[PDB]
Amino acid sequence: MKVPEKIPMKPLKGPLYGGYFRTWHDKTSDPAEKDKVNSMGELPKEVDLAFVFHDWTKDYSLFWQELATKHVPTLNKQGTRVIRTIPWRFLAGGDHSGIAEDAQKYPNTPEGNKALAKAIVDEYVYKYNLDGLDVMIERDSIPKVNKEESKEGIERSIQVFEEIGKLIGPKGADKSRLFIMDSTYMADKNPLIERGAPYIDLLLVQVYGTQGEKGGFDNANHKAVDTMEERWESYSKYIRPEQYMVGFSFYEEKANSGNLWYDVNVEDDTNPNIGSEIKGTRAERYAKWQPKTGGVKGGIFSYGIDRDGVAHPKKNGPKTPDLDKIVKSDYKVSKALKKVMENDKSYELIDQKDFPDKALREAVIAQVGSRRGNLERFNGTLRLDNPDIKSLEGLNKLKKLAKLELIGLSQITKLDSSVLPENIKPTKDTLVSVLETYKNDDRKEEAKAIPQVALTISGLTGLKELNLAGFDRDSLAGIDAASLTSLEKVDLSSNKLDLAAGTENRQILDTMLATVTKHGGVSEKTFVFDHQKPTGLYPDTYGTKSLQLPVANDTIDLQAKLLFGTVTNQGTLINSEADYKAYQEQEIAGHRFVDSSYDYKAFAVTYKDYKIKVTDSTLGVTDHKDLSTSKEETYKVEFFSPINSTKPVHEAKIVVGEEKTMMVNLAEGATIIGGDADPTNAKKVFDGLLNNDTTTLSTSNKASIIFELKEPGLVKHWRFFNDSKISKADYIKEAKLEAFVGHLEDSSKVKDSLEKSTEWVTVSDYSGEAQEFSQPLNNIGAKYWRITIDNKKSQYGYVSLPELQIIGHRLPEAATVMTTMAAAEELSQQKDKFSQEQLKELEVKVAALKAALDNKMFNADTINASFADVKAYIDK
């Protein structure tokens, strides 16, 4: 076989129509059976990408013979690229992987994977001098071994996919060949896009039928998921809009349920050619669809393009299989769809009408796009640095620009709305989507806010007039006023500017003022700025984090004393209402700039629905907005926004009377050493959460848990909770807390047996139907604990325990500190071989250790000092 050299071809210029031709429908493959009448080489000019989709069961040696020698030159002359389609599998190996099945010749090694990539390109692209490679990524193509997903194979495919990428495509050694990814996944569930995106020319998404167009439906929230715009946005961070192509499907002969997409016209006896009519179908809708941002899409494609012109059936209608017969396609659907996209507003050419200044056009084509759908969709940054610009006419046609940069445009005289993007001011999306929508959907409903373009101006030495009135700009940043030397008339009115004190807006405003007045032009009609309505923000920080209080009788409002204020973008805190009355009267040159209209209640943010969490030193928490200083504590005060219930916007430190150190829960996430309670439910007794609606039960009627503190400490308090209001009298009624005397560890090899059967010390036992029982503990420095509970109900009483806290200070070696003290109240008890005052000297160095362990301002270093003192005196 001699294969011709590639016919020379134009570069691709969109929009693009692709089509998957199935090899068993070429009359050279299996004509006595499947197909006698169709041929891939008959594809029209309107097809830009002809995809060879092959049944790998079978050889069709005459097809590949006919493809390389006759079909490819024919298609290339009309300008149609021929793309080979291979499965995901082929890049992994194992269980129908084509070339990669030769695991010995191409082992899963860094150099074997480079070898497999070269073999893939040669075998599937170069052998027949095709125009590119298409790897489709879906469930039918997923890497498998013995019919089971290969996480190994998927991971390997990511390595071969980019070895292919540096062989062919935009980053490869042969950029004439195209590298294409075809998929059904949204980027999140495409394991191959992120490393693979830099390596591909085009990206195709298979979105057939209703669910492709409208997306999936979330039955719970009653909205659409995985929509067209959602699917585009998922991929929008890996590709450019011109790389995106969407696919519909033709009716595959003898297709079964699931593969009935209804993307083309349904049968109608009275119109034998209704398929080949294209208006009103999903294929046309897809041809017309354009993402609302970024830019216009690259085109569309079709699966089973050999079936072009066959109408869909509909199942609950006629059982007649008269459509499953194979006929010859005139490809009228494909031609019509290609012409729809080319005669579309979106793909019109940006020309003299839009930007007559050509240096401005050549700066718009290259940074926005060559087509008008991009002015109404582009999403990013347009810098204008070419000084040869004579006129900024047409930027008003940019509708969604993110950032306009005016740099060194000396020859530009005036700035107004007509020479700025429409989203200099608040606007909403004017584009109406083309797709059918879910009929029971509550999403969308309204137009979307188009964010306001950031404007940067520096170097316009010929700018005289600058008008941004009524544009609702939040700030003036990006304007280097110190280089706008020609300024004569200026207007910044009816915006949201701060322009006060040392706000950077003022530095800009005053710098312009000097220039305008140095021209001799302060006159009110020139340089105006009034009627500003600065937006009020929540302060990024809050200043007061401590307040010392006496011991008296009051009810202090924590919010009014700790959480207040409103900030601007330029940074102006107004903690009190009076501050604003001083703000409104701040003046330029004798002129108020804050609108009369705008009151404190409109500017200040509201802490109305904010909520509180005040924790005492014993680790107890209430939810009340006002504190009683009647008795002495040290507190911890946190404030939470309604935006997030568990991330504090402000933390404070209240000290009523003398400071008390803040104790910790030594028991959080403690590990269940034993007991008789449910292990998966018992671990939630220490998950640092009270209202465990995650089912915080333990047994039927009487339970016990043996647990180990992660970090042994100095225990001085505990509390435990019952199932909120979630229950009535199921409330625990008896509870027994025990600790372990270290030495009694019978056989330290095990931990469960030597404790479930041994001797313990009862540190507290309790009786009552109380809601939250809290109590101090006479020291205790144990590591292994036991809790026993009982709701005094019958068998099958299902006792629960939401949260138990073993509360104290973390002091390492606390046991030994307590047993050495124990060995000290030992010795001072007897008088043998103790002088009267020699004992006295010991008894003081004992209570000095006691008093250190009891000073509520826990000083670990000092406790350890007094311990080493008492421990050494026990040594002698």
Catalytic one among 42, 138, 152, 745? 138
CB of 698 to Ca ion, least distance (A): 12
Dihedral sign for Cα 227, 228, 229, 234, please. Answer: positive
- Touching Ca ion, residues 427-466 (CB under 5 A): none
CB of 721 to Ca ion, least distance (A): 8
3-state secondary structure of 830: coil
Binding mask 692-721 for Ca ion (x = CB under 5 A): x-----------------------------
Dihedral sign for Cα 314, 319, 320, 321, please. Answer: positive
Is 138 a known active-site residue?
yes
DSSP conformational letter for 224: E
CB of 678 to Ca ion, least distance (A): 13
The smaller minimum CB distance to Ca ion, of residues 131 and 803, is found at 803
CB of 720 to Ca ion, least distance (A): 10
The smaller minimum CB distance to Ca ion, of residues 378 and 731, is found at 731
| Residue 38 backbone dihedrals phi, psi, to 5 degrees | -100, 160
CB of 694 to Ca ion, least distance (A): 9
The smaller minimum CB distance to Ca ion, of residues 334 and 805, is found at 805
Return the structure tokens found at 545.
């984090």
- Touching Ca ion, residues 781-820 (CB under 5 A): 802-803
* Cβ neighbours of residue 190 closer than 8 Å, sequence gap 6 or more: 137, 183
The smaller minimum CB distance to Ca ion, of residues 473 and 684, is found at 684
Compute the distance between CA of residue 437 and CA of residue 453 in angstroms, rounded to an integer.
30
DSSP for 593-618 reads -B-TT--HHHHS---SS-EEEEEETT
**CA 506 from chain center: how many Å?**
37
DSSP for 20-86 reads EEEGGGSTTT-TTTT-SS--GGG--TT-SEEEEE--TT---HHHHHHIIIIIHHHHHHTT-EEEEEE
CB of 774 to Ca ion, least distance (A): 15
Rounded to 10 degrees, the C-alpha dihedral 626/628/629/632 comes to -110
Residue 798 sits at the vertex; the CA angle it makes with 796 and 803, to the nearest 5 degrees, is 165
- Touching Ca ion, residues 660-689 (CB under 5 A): 684, 687, 689
CB of 726 to Ca ion, least distance (A): 13
| Cα distances (Å, whole numbers) of residue 304 to 68, 108, 247, 334, 432 | 21, 34, 11, 11, 30
The smaller minimum CB distance to Ca ion, of residues 39 and 698, is found at 698
Compute the distance between CA of residue 718 and CA of residue 824 in angstroms, rounded to an integer.
27
CB of 201 to Ca ion, least distance (A): 55
List the one residue out of 49, 190, 55 whose CA is nearest residue 132: 49
CB of 699 to Ca ion, least distance (A): 16
The smaller minimum CB distance to Ca ion, of residues 234 and 699, is found at 699
Binding mask 534-553 for Ca ion (x = CB under 5 A): --------------------
| Binding status of residue 723 toward Ca ion by CB under 5 A | no
Compute the distance between CA of residue 85 and CA of residue 89 in angstroms, rounded to an integer.
12
In the chain, after which residues is the C-to-N distance over 2.5 Å, breaking the chain?
Answer: none
Instruction: Give yes or no for a contact between 86 and 124, defined as CB atoms under 8 angstroms apart.
Output: yes
The smaller minimum CB distance to Ca ion, of residues 85 and 692, is found at 692
Dihedral sign for Cα 390, 393, 396, 397, please. Answer: negative
Residue 848 host element (H or E): helix 836-854
By beta carbon distance, the residue nearest Ca ion is: 803
The smaller minimum CB distance to Ca ion, of residues 494 and 722, is found at 722
Binding mask 744-783 for Ca ion (x = CB under 5 A): ----------------------------------------
Bond from prior residue into 451 cis (ω within 30 degrees of 0): no
The smaller minimum CB distance to Ca ion, of residues 17 and 721, is found at 721
Could you tell me how many residues of this chain bind Ca ion (CB under 5 A)?
Answer: 6
The smaller minimum CB distance to Ca ion, of residues 181 and 685, is found at 685
The smaller minimum CB distance to Ca ion, of residues 352 and 680, is found at 680
List the one residue out of 293, 211, 194 whose CA is nearest residue 249: 211
3-state secondary structure of 326: coil
DSSP for 534-592 reads PPPB--SS-S--EEEE-SSS--EEHHHHHS---B-TT-----SHHHHHHHHT-EETTEE
Strand partners, 808: 664, 715
The smaller minimum CB distance to Ca ion, of residues 676 and 687, is found at 687
CB of 601 to Ca ion, least distance (A): 42
Instruction: Give yes or no for a contact between 677 and 816, defined as CB atoms under 8 angstroms apart.
Output: no
CB of 142 to Ca ion, least distance (A): 42
Instruction: Give yes or no for a contact between 172 and 165, defined as CB atoms under 8 angstroms apart.
Output: yes
Helices 110-121, 151-165: crossing angle, 10 deg rounding: 60
The smaller minimum CB distance to Ca ion, of residues 183 and 681, is found at 681
CB of 668 to Ca ion, least distance (A): 9
Strand partners, 613: 638
Sheet with 546-549: strands ordered across: 546-549, 650-656, 633-640, 611-616, 621-622
Residue 831 sits at the vertex; the CA angle it makes with 830 and 837, to the nearest 5 degrees, is 130
Instruction: Give yes or no for a contact between 21 and 40, defined as CB atoms under 8 angstroms apart.
Output: yes
Compute the distance between CA of residue 698 and CA of residue 695 in angstroms, rounded to an integer.
9
Compute the distance between CA of residue 183 and CA of residue 190 in angstroms, rounded to an integer.
8
CB of 710 to Ca ion, least distance (A): 15
Instruction: Give yes or no for a contact between 333 and 264, defined as CB atoms under 8 angstroms apart.
Output: yes
Which positions are catalytic?
A: 138
Residues lying near Ca ion in the complex (CB under 5 A):
684, 687, 689, 692, 802-803
